[PDB]
Design a protein around this ligand. Structure first.
Ligand SMILES: CCCCCCCCCCCCCCCCCC(=O)OC[C@H](CO[C@@H]1O[C@H](CO[C@H]2O[C@H](CO)[C@H](O)[C@H](O)[C@H]2O)[C@H](O)[C@H](O)[C@H]1O)OC(=O)CCCCCCCCCCCCCCCCC
Ligand code: CLA
Ligand code: CLA
Ligand code: CLA
Ligand code: CLA
Ligand code: CLA
Ligand SMILES: CCCCCCCCCCCCCCCC(=O)OC[C@H](CO[C@@H]1O[C@H](CS(=O)(=O)O)[C@@H](O)[C@H](O)[C@H]1O)OC(=O)CCCCCCCCCCCCCCC
Ligand SMILES: CC1=C(/C=C/C(C)=C/C=C/C(C)=C/C=C/C=C(C)/C=C/C=C(C)/C=C/C2=C(C)CCCC2(C)C)C(C)(C)CCC1
Ligand SMILES: CC1=C(/C=C/C(C)=C/C=C/C(C)=C/C=C/C=C(C)/C=C/C=C(C)/C=C/C2=C(C)CCCC2(C)C)C(C)(C)CCC1
Ligand SMILES: CC1=C(/C=C/C(C)=C/C=C/C(C)=C/C=C/C=C(C)/C=C/C=C(C)/C=C/C2=C(C)CCCC2(C)C)C(C)(C)CCC1
Ligand SMILES: CC1=C(/C=C/C(C)=C/C=C/C(C)=C/C=C/C=C(C)/C=C/C=C(C)/C=C/C2=C(C)CCCC2(C)C)C(C)(C)CCC1
Ligand SMILES: CCCCCCCS[C@@H]1O[C@H](CO)[C@@H](O)[C@H](O)[C@H]1O
Ligand code: OEX
Ligand SMILES: [Ca+2]
Ligand SMILES: [Ca+2]
Ligand SMILES: [Cl-]
Ligand SMILES: [Cl-]
Ligand SMILES: [Fe+2]
Ligand SMILES: [Mg+2]
Lengths: 81, 57, 38, 37, 451, 334, 30, 34, 341
């Protein structure tokens, strides 16, 4: 052994489950809402199903300039009106 | 005895002979340089640096 | 609280069933909504 | 489809074929309960 | 709790069922309960299929494997294999499901409540693995039972409706078998055919008379052998040749089951008589051929002379010769010229595909059938996307022929592995070194050096 | 003792430099025949019409190949799954044109190797060993069966069996990818985990044991001389190696049981390769890799490509190019 | 942004809860 | 007799916390429609 | 015993997870590479770099998610969050493929950290550092494939993208464009990996089947004691068995295990060398004699020429979607195709 309490002990303790029957669902719900609120989309810049193309466009908004790449992506985004 | 991949370890505590082996290595490398330059000279065509420079040859 | 109260076999069973439920959900999602090809 | 009268049991019927697999899983629960002696 | 931990049994939990080896009552329980599992799956899976069943779609568009088995026996279908009544399916499913309750009941009883060993209870039901007599007697019983089963297939075929016959004159249909093939020349003739192309061993059976007659032969043979093993005990040569122990017997049966699994794989993959393509979909050969036929028909309608059309390779684009001269379909399907099916045979003459028959006699139903079979070839993805591996999602289809063939190859294989495992172990244990080498009696140490 | 008894005793003798045995009785002639025919064919066989379209492919050294390009070429698509022994040909010249050597070699080899497995069982028995080395060998053998026998049966022709050669092997893999998307098949993936994993664990075991070798030698000699064949004492400190690995990850991720450990070392690659073989064997019946072609779709219905769709493009290249004169109709159905 | 509060309110309530429940043993440890 | 907040505790939670959050997210994703 | 030595004391405490000086490099980098990959494959797109969906959020599954390489226009930019491309914007950074370089770089320093860990622990426990040494092969593979290879090419774009399907595409690209299977260094890698798997299998199976009976159990695992001095299986019986089966057999245990180290490690190193070649397009693509013969003689066919036709198909059919920065438009009529297909 190396001093820490056995996991067998911890995960079968009543206290562990009093704590984690709160903390685990809380997290799960936090992640759930992170998606369902739409926040994920905006944090990582990921297209929603209606934001990949404008209505009649069919050209991928591929980044083509290294240093003004950012302004390129911003332009691609504005192009969705 | 020493395994084949260890024969050179005999130089570890013999500074003189280690220097000798390094001298031999350096001789071989210099000899390579000279030889290689001679071969290139015996094959290099200097007549057209424009469309037949050294890197084409 | 004291360790050993909840039997390890129940914990393993519950945990297992939970794993089966969440992966079940994901395989359901292969046929529904995004990624479903429909 | 099933005869109309048994329509009520359609969800049950959807689940039944997987019941055999449960037995395999049960063998393990059982073993866990006797500590894999 | 007798023999239910490693210290007492010798066996770890993961080899736990090996604790049942000389506990005949509990082992009886495991077996009856397992039988219950099997019958349970049969019934439940049947009712599931029936619930998911649309009678005007082909079965093979609907992931069915058991309803096709029932339909092949003539139950529930009419001409062309059209579903005319689902009720027999329902009956088959329900009755299997009800029976599985009985079997599970007896299983659980013998398993955890009944006598753990049977020998002190009944000298009839008790048994010693080493008792060659009793072993051959139980074997005998079960051979009689099997023979009875095969005879039940015969009885269905001859006296209770008949079987579905894809080769029935005028179109596939349920037909009563009135003149089964009883000639041993034919029946065992099948057994002595090459398993190779154009021959196909027993997989080549292509008419219901040979099937019914074959099952008559098998029924008699099995009942006979069963009685014979009841009344006899193994001979000297047999005694010397075999390992006589539970694990040995298990190993023999595992070898046999492996063999049967491979056979069933080839059967469902090639044979379209006991696996009518109406129910199981076209075989691979069948569908490839069907494509050739389809385009011969298209192009000939457009005015092409298919007999004389020369393909890019110099071989005919539509028609060419087999290595023995027969006229056969061209392109890659040249490999499949051993294919035979009721929709193509009207175009076949003594020299193979008949060019006059091809020019004049192709009926619309043949075109239809070839288009269907061509567009339901047994190709598809693991997530049941129908078509070649490069096809886009759209068609939800994987042929039952693929499902059955692949599943049973896997099972046959792992069962061969199991046979090597338990055979090797049975040998070692019977010889007494399954647990390892005696340090004080290492045999190699008593042997002369190799060099 | 009679002559047959003597003969049996020699056959099963634990003292022959190479064990013969009863499996050996079948193994030795079949493997010799397959070997000899393979060497001669590889050196001197004429071009073979593999795809039955009168387009002979040259496999041997004398006919324009090197070690890398050369092969014994599979029998003709016209033959299909027909048995094509030498005596079925009108002449050796025909036999050779149609790729008879291939069938002779793979049949003799498959029989011979199956017997090699059986022979591993047999010797293990004669020597008083436990019997399952042959079960380990069942995995590479099953693989061989998959690519030489089962896939041809499924596809209805030995012309689609694996070629006996290096580049031919690659041909087989590429066409297999094209027609089955084998990369996206979980059994091939398990097979990869089997061989990557086996490689990993081989290096790991080797390095741990080597790392904990007990000092028995000087620096001027090989550490190997510290072990003597047959010595009863273990030659490495397994407690030390376990202390190391256990601390490298955590304790309960390490094996303290050498038997358990070696059993793992056997089971992981063997099971993985079993799944590789079952993969080839089930793709033999066209149950293919996962198809997620056009699986992601935007709100209008535009296809949004994933890496799966790029894979599919590559597969298309292979599909349209392979066997460029053999297809007359739009669907490649075998 | 309200969605960050809505989403990370479960997390901070979990942490607050467990801090409340483990506080005496944590103080005893520290 | 036993400590609660060890190095092991940390490691365990740096892995376990984000995992449960992520699985909540992915769960949610299963009901997204185009 | 000043601050440095006290710190050393704490770093080397025998706890459930050993930390060590090497832990300081290893844990943050390993954690950030794993986190980067999970973050990316759960939430991040590849629309703006590849025109691909690559995350769970977009509907991909475990087989098809990936953290994709940056756009070819990025070149070999470190693509730091604070760099001139993202300029501190986390979202744009994700959209430009910052996660790829994040994962590749933190991953590389993580592998460094891990091998340092192998050294440190081996030195603490008093064993020879052959595990670290063996781990140099994983390092060579990672550095050659994820760093050197794209650094030789136009940009990070042509590095492998971190994902299952993505890796598959990497394989297929290397076949089509490099004829990588024809490369003798790849071939040696294959020999090393398969020979490694074989050695794993055969050694494990052999030990398990030449065990001494050291207990009464029919399940024979408990009949071993980690402290026992005796060999648990018979090397002599094993030797005779393989000698009679295969002709040759191991007789030296130390050599056996060294060999087990040597085969896969060497193999992976050769594969690495080959990939370093492929970085410059220095391929083993053709056999010149083959091409001269086949170009002059339209009846000369081998599996070598067959596979090149396959490659040509791969190139033409995958290039336009796989290489979008090139704006390839290949009209139908120029696509290479066999009859009918
Ligand atoms: C104790 C055993 C000892 C064994 C010792 C060795 C003895 C020889 C064994 C033969 C090995 C296989 C040879 C080729 C098998 C094959 O081509 O099998 C195919 C044949 C089927 O033949 C096909 O059968 C067809 C019959 O259908 C015909 O009839 C039908 C009627 O409806 C239809 O009309 C159909 O369209 C029509 O063509 C045709 O004749 C085809 O041309 C023909 O190819 O199956 C069959 O005969 C029978 C099925 C055989 C099993 C398949 C092999 C499995 C081996 C797995 C080993 C794994 C090992 C792992 C090791 C670790
Ligand atoms: C088809 C699969 C199958 C079957 C039929 C069996 C059967 C058996 N096992 Mg095996 N076993 C299996 C798979 C199976 N096993 C698997 C997968 C493992 C690995 C986990 C094992 C590991 C194992 C070990 C280590 C041992 C056994 C033992 C046994 C025997 C006694 C069990 C007992 O008395 O426990 C008592 C169990 C209970 C009291 C709980 C209730 C169990 C019942 C059967 C549940 C019934 C459920 C069912 C739905 C009820 C329907 C009723 C309805 C008809 C009215 C029994 C014959 C033991 C043995 O051999 O003893 C001699 C033993 O030691 N098994
Ligand atoms: C009629 C078929 C049959 C029967 C009655 C037996 C019976 C036996 N086997 Mg054998 N065996 C068989 C086929 C069979 N085997 C096959 C086909 C193989 C090849 C895999 C083996 C390989 C094998 C080995 C290596 C060993 C045995 C052993 C045994 C003995 C103990 C078994 C046990 O308790 O496992 C308990 C059950 C388990 C631990 C569960 C197994 C879990 C499997 C692998 C999961 C399979 C996945 C499933 C099919 C699908 C996924 C479902 C999931 C998602 C829920 C027992 C006599 C042991 C022995 O030697 O006894 C002397 C032993 O060591 N068998
Ligand atoms: C299938 C194999 C099988 C075998 C070999 C046995 C053997 C035994 N059982 Mg068990 N049992 C079984 C299955 C089996 N049973 C099933 C399926 C059930 C659920 C009904 C039971 C429920 C059960 C109970 C409650 C008891 C037994 C008892 C016994 C013992 C006394 C038998 C006797 O004298 O009956 C005499 C035989 C008859 C009176 C004639 C039987 C008529 C049969 C059933 C007609 C059908 C025949 C036909 C072939 C069935 C086909 C089924 C197939 C389609 C699936 C004997 C060891 C007794 C025991 O163990 O005492 C300690 C006992 O109390 N059994
Ligand atoms: C469940 C099926 C079954 C099983 C397991 C047995 C088992 C046995 N039988 Mg029995 N038998 C059976 C059904 C069965 N029988 C039936 C249905 C009949 C009526 C036909 C018989 C008639 C019978 C007789 C007359 C005798 C036996 C005997 C025996 C014993 C030794 C047999 C032997 O060594 O086989 C191994 C087989 C051989 C050694 C034969 C030659 C081996 C070659 C190489 C076989 C090659 C076949 C090939 C692989 C198959 C491919 C297909 C082929 C048709 C081309 C053994 C206990 C003998 C005995 O001892 O009785 C007390 C005996 O004299 N049986
Ligand atoms: C004889 C075996 C067999 C065959 C050929 C089929 C075939 C089919 N089933 Mg059925 N079914 C079976 C057994 C079988 N099933 C069993 C045992 C169950 C209970 C779980 C079911 C319950 C069931 C349901 C509820 C449904 C089907 C459906 C289907 C159809 C679609 C299949 C599919 O998409 O699978 C997907 C493929 C997989 C899930 C891959 C499984 C891979 C396995 C786990 C690998 C196992 C390897 C080995 C055994 C492990 C050993 C370990 C080793 C170390 C020894 C197809 C016709 C569907 C249908 O369309 O009905 C109309 C459907 O809805 N089946
Ligand atoms: C993203 C920003 C990155 C920048 C860097 C910011 C973080 C710096 C790196 C921190 C890495 C390690 C942090 C956790 C260390 C720890 O848990 O110590 C646990 C210690 C002592 O616990 C004691 O620990 C001992 C057990 S053991 O040492 O944990 O094994 C035991 O002796 C004792 O009884 C027990 O109470 O308690 C603390 O005070 C931790 C201080 C906060 C950290
Ligand atoms: C004595 C004398 C002299 C002389 C000298 C001389 C004459 C010298 C020479 C020298 C030389 C002349 C040298 C040379 C050398 C060389 C070398 C050293 C080389 C090496 C090589 C290598 C090593 C290679 C390798 C390889 C290969 C082969 C393949 C590919 C890969 C590689 C690249 C790796 C004089 C008079 C002057 C003076 C004094 C006296
Ligand atoms: C021994 C053992 C075991 C096993 C067991 C088993 C395997 C059992 C089985 C059992 C069984 C095998 C059971 C069965 C049951 C069944 C039932 C109970 C059923 C019922 C049915 C019903 C109720 C029906 C109904 C209906 C109708 C009638 C109509 C239609 C619809 C419906 C469906 C509704 C284990 C492993 C656990 C472990 C321990 C030992
Ligand atoms: C139903 C049917 C049929 C028929 C069938 C039959 C008639 C069958 C028979 C079958 C038979 C008749 C079988 C047999 C088999 C046999 C076997 C499979 C054997 C085995 C053997 C063994 C295994 C042995 C071994 C050994 C050796 C070799 C040496 C010494 C040692 C020992 C003894 C181990 C047909 C097709 C017409 C049609 C369809 C339906
Ligand atoms: C990137 C980045 C970062 C980081 C972040 C992190 C660190 C994250 C982490 C994250 C994480 C850490 C996540 C996790 C997740 C997890 C998951 C999502 C899982 C899942 C699982 C599953 C799904 C399972 C499955 C399975 C298996 C595997 C086998 C067995 C069976 C089963 C099926 C159950 C920072 C801020 C620095 C900066 C910026 C960038
Ligand atoms: C990097 C390690 C540099 C150690 S620095 C070292 O630290 C001691 C106290 O620990 C001082 O007493 C000493 O003067 C100083 O040189
Ligand atoms: O032969 Mn060799 O490769 Ca099996 O798919 Mn069909 O055929 Mn041919 O094409 Mn694709
Ligand atoms: Ca008897
Ligand atoms: Ca919408
Ligand atoms: Cl064609
Ligand atoms: Cl090709
Ligand atoms: Fe070892
Ligand atoms: Mg979805």
């Amino acid at each position: 052994t190396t001093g820490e309490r056995p996991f067998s002990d911890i995960i079968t303790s009543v206290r562990y489950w009093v704590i984690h029957s709160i903390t685990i669902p809380a997290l799960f719900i936090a992640g759930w809402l992170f998606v369902s609120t739409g926040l994920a989309y905006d944090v990582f810049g990921t297209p929603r199903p209606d934001s990949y193309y404008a209505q009649e466009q069919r050209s991928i908004p591929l980044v083509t300039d290294r240093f003004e790449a950012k302004q390129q992506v911003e332009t691609f985004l504005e192009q969705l009106k | 005895g020493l395994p084949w991949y260890r024969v050179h370890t005999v130089l570890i505590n013999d500074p003189g002979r280690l220097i000798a082996a390094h001298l031999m290595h350096t001789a071989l490398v210099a000899g390579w340089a000279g030889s290689m330059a001679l071969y290139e000279l015996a094959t290099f065509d200097p007549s057209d640096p424009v469309l037949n420079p050294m890197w084409r040859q | 609280s004291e360790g050993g109260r909840i039997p390890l076999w129940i914990v393993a069973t519950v945990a297992g069933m939970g794993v089966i439920v969440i992966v079940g959900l994901f395989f359901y999602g292969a046929y529904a909504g995004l990624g479903s090809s429909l | 489809k099933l005869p109309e009268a048994y329509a009520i049991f359609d969800p049950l019927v959807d689940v039944l074929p997987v019941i055999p697999v449960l037995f395999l899983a049960l063998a393990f629960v059982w073993q866990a309960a006797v500590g894999f002696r | 709790a007798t023999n239910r931990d490693q210290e007492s049994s010798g066996f770890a939990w993961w080899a736990g069922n090996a604790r049942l080896i000389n506990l005949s009552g509990k082992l009886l329980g495991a077996h009856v309960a397992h039988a219950g599992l099997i019958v349970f799956w049969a019934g439940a899976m049947t009712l599931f299929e029936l619930a998911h069943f649309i009678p005007e779609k082909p079965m093979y568009e609907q992931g069915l494997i058991l309803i096709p088995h029932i339909a092949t026996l003539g139950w529930g279908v009419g001409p062309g294999g059209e579903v005319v009544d689902t009720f027999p399916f329902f009956v088959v499913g329900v009755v299997h499901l009800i029976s599985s309750a009985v079997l599970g009941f007896g299983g659980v009883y013998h398993a955890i409540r009944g006598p753990e060993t049977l020998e002190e209870y009944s000298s009839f039901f008790g048994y010693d693995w080493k008792d060659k007599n009793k072993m051959t007697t139980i074997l005998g019983f079960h051979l009689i039972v099997l023979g009875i089963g095969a005879l039940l297939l015969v009885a269905k075929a001859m006296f209770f409706g008949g079987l579905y016959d894809t080769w029935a004159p005028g179109g596939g249909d349920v037909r009563v078998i009135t003149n089964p093939t009883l000639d041993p020349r034919v029946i065992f003739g099948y057994l002595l055919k090459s398993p190779f192309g154009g021959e196909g061993w027993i997989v080549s059976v292509n008419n219901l008379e040979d099937v019914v007659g074959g099952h008559i032969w098998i029924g008699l043979i099995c009942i006979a052998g069963g009685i014979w093993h009841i009344l006899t005990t193994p001979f000297g040569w047999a005694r010397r040749a075999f390992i006589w122990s539970g694990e040995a017997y298990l190993s023999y049966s595992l070898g046999a089951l492996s063999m049967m699994g491979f056979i069933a794989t080839c059967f469902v993959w090639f044979n379209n008589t006991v696996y009518p393509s109406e129910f199981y979909g076209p075989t691979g050969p069948e569908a490839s051929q069907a494509q050739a036929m389809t385009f011969l028909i298209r192009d000939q309608k457009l005015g092409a002379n298919v007999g004389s059309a020369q393909g890019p390779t110099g071989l005919g684009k539509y028609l060419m010769r087999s290595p023995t001269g027969e006229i056969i379909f061209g392109g890659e399907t040249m490999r499949f010229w051993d294919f035979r099916g009721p929709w193509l045979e009207p175009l076949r003459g003594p020299n193979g595909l008949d060019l006059n028959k091809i020019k004049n006699d192709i009926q619309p139903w043949q075109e239809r059938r070839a288009a269907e079979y061509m567009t339901h070839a047994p190709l598809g993805s693991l997530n049941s996307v129908g078509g070649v591996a490069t096809e886009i999602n759209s068609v939800n289809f994987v042929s039952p022929r693929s499902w059955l063939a692949t599943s049973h190859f896997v099972l046959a294989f792992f069962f061969l592995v199991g046979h090597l495992w338990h055979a090797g172990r049975a040998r070692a244990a019977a010889a007494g070194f399954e647990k390892g080498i005696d340090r004080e009696s290492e045999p190699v140490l008593s042997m002369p050096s190799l060099d | 003792a009679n002559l047959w008894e003597r003969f049996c005793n020699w056959v099963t003798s634990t003292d022959n430099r190479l064990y013969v045995g009863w499996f050996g009785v079948i193994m030795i002639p079949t493997l010799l025949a397959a070997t000899i025919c393979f060497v001669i064919a590889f050196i001197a066989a004429p071009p073979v019409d593999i795809d039955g379209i009168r387009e002979p492919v040259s496999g041997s050294l004398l006919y324009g190949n090197n070690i890398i390009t050369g092969a014994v070429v599979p029998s003709s698509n016209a033959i299909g799954l027909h048995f094509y022994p030498i005596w079925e040909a009108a002449s050796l010249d025909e036999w050779l044109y149609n790729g008879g050597p291939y069938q002779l070699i793979i049949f003799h080899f498959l029989l011979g190797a199956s017997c090699y497995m059986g022979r591993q069982w047999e010797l293990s028995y004669r020597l008083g060993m436990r019997p399952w080395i042959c079960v380990a060998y069942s995995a590479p053998l099953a693989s061989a069966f998959a690519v030489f026998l089962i896939y041809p049966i499924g596809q209805g022709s030995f012309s689609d069996g694996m070629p006996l050669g290096i580049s031919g092997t690659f041909n087989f893999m590429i066409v297999f990818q094209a027609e089955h998307n084998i990369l996206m098949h979980p059994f091939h993936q398990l097979g990869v985990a089997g061989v990557f994993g086996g490689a990993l664990f081989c290096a790991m075991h080797g390095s741990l044991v080597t790392s904990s070798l007990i000092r028995e030698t000087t620096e001027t000699e090989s550490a190997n001389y510290g072990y003597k064949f047959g010595q009863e004492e273990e030659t490495y400190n397994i407690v030390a190696a376990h202390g190391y690995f256990g601390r490298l990850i955590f304790q309960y991720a390490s094996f303290n049981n050498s038997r358990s450990l070696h059993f793992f070392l056997a089971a992981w690659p063997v099971v993985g390769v079993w799944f590789a073989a079952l993969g080839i064997s089930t793709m033999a019946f066209n149950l293919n890799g996962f198809n997620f072609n056009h699986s992601v779709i935007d709100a209008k219905g535009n296809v949004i490509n994933t890496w799966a769709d790029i894979i599919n493009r590559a597969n298309l290249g292979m599909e349209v190019m392979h066997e460029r004169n053999a297809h007359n109709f739009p669907l490649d159905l075998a | 942004d309200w969605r960050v509060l809505v989403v990370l309110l479960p997390v901070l309530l979990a942490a607050g809860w467990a801090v409340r429940n483990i506080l005496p043993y944590a103080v005893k440890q520290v | 007799s036993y400590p609660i907040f060890t190095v092991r505790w940390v490691a365990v939670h740096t892995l376990a916390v984000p995992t449960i959050f992520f699985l909540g997210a992915i769960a949610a994703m299963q009901f997204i429609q185009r | 015993r000043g601050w440095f030595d006290i710190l050393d004391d704490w770093l080397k405490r025998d706890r459930f997870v050993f930390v060590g000086w090497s832990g300081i490099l290893l844990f943050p980098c390993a954690y950030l590479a794993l986190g980067g990959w999970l973050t990316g494959t759960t939430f991040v797109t590849s629309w703006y770099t590849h025109g691909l969906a690559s995350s769970y959020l977009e509907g991909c599954n475990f087989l098809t998610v990936a953290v994709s390489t940056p756009a070819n226009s990025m070149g070999h930019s470190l693509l730091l969050l604070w760099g001139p491309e993202a300029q501190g914007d986390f979202t744009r950074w994700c959209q430009l493929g910052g996660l790829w370089t994040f994962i590749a770089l933190h991953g590389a320093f993580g592998l460094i950290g891990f091998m340092l860990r192998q050294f440190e622990i081996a030195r603490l426990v008093g064993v020879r550092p052959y595990n670290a040494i063996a781990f140099s092969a994983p390092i060579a593979v990672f550095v050659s494939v994820f760093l050197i290879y794209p650094l030789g090419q136009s940009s990070w774009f042509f590095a492998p993208s971190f994902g299952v399907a993505a890796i598959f595409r990497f394989l297929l690209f290397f076949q089509g464009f490099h004829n990588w299977t024809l490369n003798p260094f790849h071939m040696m890698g294959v020999a090393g990996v398969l020979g490694g798997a074989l050695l794993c299998a055969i050694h494990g199976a052999t030990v398990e089947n030449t065990l001494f009976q050291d207990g009464e159990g029919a399940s024979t695992f408990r009949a071993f004691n980690p402290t026992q001095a005796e060999e648990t299986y018979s090397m002599v019986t094993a030797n005779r068995f393989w000698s009679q089966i295969f002709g040759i057999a191991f007789s030296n245990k130390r050599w056996l295990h060294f060999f087990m180290l040597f085969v896969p490690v060497t193999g992976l190193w050769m594969s690495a060398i080959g990939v370093v070649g492929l970085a410059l397009n220095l391929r083993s693509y053709d056999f010149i004699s083959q091409e001269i013969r086949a170009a002059e003689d339209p009846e000369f066919e081998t599996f070598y020429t067959k596979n090149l036709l396959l490659n040509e198909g791969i190139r033409a059919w995958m290039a336009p979607q796989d290489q979008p920065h090139e704006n390839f438009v290949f009209p139908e009529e120029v696509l290479p195709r066999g009859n009918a297909l």
